Amino acid sequence: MNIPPARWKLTCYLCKQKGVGASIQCHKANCYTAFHVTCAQKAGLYMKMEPVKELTGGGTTFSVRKTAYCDVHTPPGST
Ligand SMILES: [Zn+2]
Ligand SMILES: [Zn+2]
């Protein structure tokens, strides 16, 4: 049928399921690791947080772009 929602709820490896709250997909396109925001806070994994500021439309536009890697994504690529 004509389904307006297109929310591709990803599978959270820290769950083995999908839906419950919000999903976040880890960086690196050759990886794409999906989990929950609650899982990220729970593990305390690597999250880079870049704030973009703009004034588009004669005002202020704020977009935060978080670059996150899954917990088992940190060891691959030894810093
Ligand atoms: Zn989870
Ligand atoms: Zn990953």
Full 3-state SS string of 29-55? CCCCCEEEHHHHHHHCCCEEEEEEEEC
Instruction: Report the Cα–Cα distance between both ends of the chain, in Å, rounded.
Output: 49
Structure tokens at 38: 């609650």
**How many angstroms does the Cα of residue 22 sit away from the middle of ligand 1?**
9
Structure tokens at 60: 């202020």
DSSP run (H or E) holding 34:
strand 34-36
For residue 31, give the ligand nearest its CA. 2
How was it solved? NMR
Compute and round to an integer the Cα radius of gyration of the chain. 16
Phi/psi-derived region of residue 64, left when phi > 0, alpha when psi is between -120 and 50, beta in every other case: beta
Residue 12 phi, psi dihedral angles, 5° rounding: -95, 115
Tally DSSP H helices, then E strands, for the chain.
Answer: 1, 4
Query: Residue 53 forms beta bridges with which residues?
Result: 62
Kindly report the number of other CB atoms within 10 A of residue 32's CB atom.
11
